[PDB]
Amino acid sequence: EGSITQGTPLKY
Amino acid sequence: FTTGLVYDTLMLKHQCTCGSSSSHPEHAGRIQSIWSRLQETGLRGKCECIRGRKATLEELQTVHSEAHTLLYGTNPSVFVRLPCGGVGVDSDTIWNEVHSAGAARLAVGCVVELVFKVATGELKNGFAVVRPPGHHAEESTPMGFCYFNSVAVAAKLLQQRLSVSKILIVDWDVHHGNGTQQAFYSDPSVLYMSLHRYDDGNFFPGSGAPDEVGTGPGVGFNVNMAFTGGLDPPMGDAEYLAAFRTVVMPIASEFAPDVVLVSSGFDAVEGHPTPLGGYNLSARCFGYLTKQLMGLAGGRIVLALEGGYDLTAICDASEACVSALLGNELDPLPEKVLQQRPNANAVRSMEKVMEIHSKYWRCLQRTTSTAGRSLIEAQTCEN
Ligand SMILES: [K+]
Ligand SMILES: [K+]
Ligand SMILES: [Zn+2]
Ligand SMILES: [Zn+2]
């Protein structure tokens, strides 16, 4: 679970 | 020939119920400030005013599954209660149960109405002041403030209704457009081309490696110009202009598109918060990048708004882009930009992208490897 607000990539 | 603008105030209604404007960077004022800037500068009077419309569910189904269009295109569970107190599908993408369905369809329809008016010759070019952004949305997965991929729907509709054979999609939003890539990953007839911060998958959404070249018949028709190395130094105008001179233009020219659609994100402009972008592109640089794309496809080009969240940045960038679409003479680039060499991180990224796509594009040999040259140094050797 990543966020565009934080710049965190999606990952599983 | 007239440039066209499309805008509708019903898209302002897409807003979270919490009443905390600070928590949602993709807010209604991003387009209101842009439309106000186009009015006060007088550019709105130089352009035709295009009226929008909601996209039909059949139009949205060219890209998205029917369950996706029914869930987010219509009103009477994936929905959850957000920490802000509004409804949404995840922490990023808020959902207003009353207005959001008509705003997303209106965003896809305003882009489709503008793209078709340019493709049919009613307009020389266009710019769509639309929200929510669409380039992150997938066939069934909203994400990244996105629900429907407005640029992908306009591209599919250009094929099924006008039988266009070659379509170029440039995506200079600082984030990778994962949904626009997935929609055409196997299609030779549409060349996706994304420029984005990547940092080896440590940035949102984490997709968009240079090795992702498409699949099947469409191999070699997906060009991920992925920057890497973080913000050390952050990419500037010299790095984007070099990527156009070395990678974007040579590939787009060999493709010879019949149409050019642009996912015109402005989060790469300077002054954005670092997590949302962190690049230092000038708004004047985006006007030059628009004018370079205008030489493709006979000038058949349409820009559609995507990202970009600083109000002063997206207004200066929307002004430079529409001013470029009108044929107005550009403000000259600063000498610091013309003489600056690209930073070594941008050079390693461009050469890594050129190393992969030289296999597929024959003219990616003259620029291998001029990636490190400044724009003045490249104009020197080309004479
Ligand atoms: K991009
Ligand atoms: K493709
Ligand atoms: Zn909220
Ligand atoms: Zn973005």
Numbering used by the authors:
A (entry chain A): 7 to 18
B (entry chain G): 652 to 727, 744 to 1050
Provide passages from the article that reported this PDB entry.
For the SRD3c protein, we designed two peptides (SP1: −3HIRGSITQGIPRSYV+12, SP2: −2KEGSITQGTPLKY+11), which include the GSI motif in the sequences. For kinetic analysis of peptide binding to HDAC4c H976Y (R651-T1055), we performed ITC experiments and obtained a dissociation constant of 2.23 μM for SP1 and 18.8 μM for SP2. Consistent with this, these peptides inhibited the in vitro deacetylase activity of HDAC4c H976Y, with a better inhibitory effect of SP1 than that of SP2. Overall, the refined HDAC4c-peptide structures superpose well on the apo-form structure, indicating that peptides binding did not rearrange the catalytic and structural zinc ion-binding sites. The bound peptides commonly form a β-hairpin structure of two β-strands in the HDAC4c cleft leading to the catalytic zinc ion. The hydrophobic I+3 residues (I1363 or I1459) are at the β-turn near the catalytic zinc ion and intervened with F812 and F871 at the end of the cleft and entrance to the catalytic pocket of the HDAC4c. At one side of the cleft, a water molecule (w4) mediates the interaction between the carbonyl oxygen of I+3 in both peptides with the side-chain of H842 of the catalytic subdomain. At the two loops of S744–W762 and H803–G811 of the structural zinc ion-binding site, D759 hydrogen-bonds with the hydroxyl group of T+4 and peptidyl nitrogen atom between S+2 and I+3 in two peptides. Notably, D757 interacts indirectly with R+9 of the bound SP1 via a water molecule (w8), which is missing in the SP2-bound structure with L+9 at the corresponding position. The two motifs are very close to each other, with a major difference in the structurally relevant positions R+9 in SM1 and L+9 in SM2.
